[PDB]
């Protein structure tokens, strides 16, 4: 279980943990094991979070919080308080949907959500990348459907492509187990590659640094 170097080994960063809440490797102990290695590398907190999800709220990650993201936090909390110690579990946050959209977090949503509208070519790029993700599964879903999924994803990219804080509490880096069409996607963003003026109206010369951990 290591980094797939030099700042990370010398604790520079705060490390978040990404839960994608449904993905059959985000079982309690691979999340064990990625709080485990959080907690021996980061500068000084852990923050846990639901990263994605692929009507009891306005919000598709409000309504996943509240119905499933929960549970899963109260099963990581009780795992946690027998694997580690009482000083390590000092060390990390539980942060929900809200701790992280505060109103910054939520112009740059907001931004983005305009974008789709009005943006023929990126609404087009990012409704034919959720046909991708449901390309490789059984279940069919109409046009309306993916269209639903796509605002999905904007709603989470921003924690994606900038340094946030949760609670209070910046994070400069997160662990994922894999690189994903998302993680590609965000890193062409950061630089200015595709959609440039993403770039230029919601990040800030501080990106958010993408951490491979696996097996």
């Not at 170097?5 to 059959?24: F, Q, R, T």
């Not at 390590?88 to 942060?95: D, L, N, R, S, V």
């Not at 977090?105 to 046909?131: A, C, G, P, Q, S």
């Not at 994070?171 to 994903?180: G, H, I, L, R, S």
Request: aromatic residues 14%; glycine residues 4%.
């Amino acid at each position: 279980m290591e980094l797939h170097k030099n700042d990370i080994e010398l604790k520079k960063y705060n490390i978040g943990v990404a839960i994608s809440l449904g993905n059959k490797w985000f079982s309690i102990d691979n999340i064990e094991k990625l709080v485990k290695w959080s907690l021996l590398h980061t500068k000084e907190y852990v923050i846990i979070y639901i990263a994605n999800s692929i009507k009891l709220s306005d919000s598709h990650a409000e309504e996943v919080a509240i119905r499933y993201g929960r549970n899963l936090f109260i099963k990581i909390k009780e795992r946690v308080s027998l694997s580690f110690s009482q000083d390590e579990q000092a060390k990390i946050i539980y942060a929900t949907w809200s701790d992280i959209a505060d109103s910054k977090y939520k112009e740059k949503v907001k931004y983005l959500y305009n974008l789709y509208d009005k943006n023929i070519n990126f609404k087009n790029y990012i409704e034919n990348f959720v046909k991708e993700w449901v390309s490789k599964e059984k279940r069919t879903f109409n046009n309306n459907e993916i269209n639903k999924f796509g605002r999905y994803i904007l709603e989470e990219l921003p924690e994606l492509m900038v340094q946030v804080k949760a609670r209070g509490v910046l994070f400069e880096a997160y662990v994922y187990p894999y690189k994903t069409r998302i993680t590609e996607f965000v890193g062409l963003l950061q630089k200015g590659e595709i959609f440039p003026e993403i770039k230029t109206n919601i990040l800030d010369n501080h990106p958010k640094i993408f951490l491979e951990v696996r097996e």
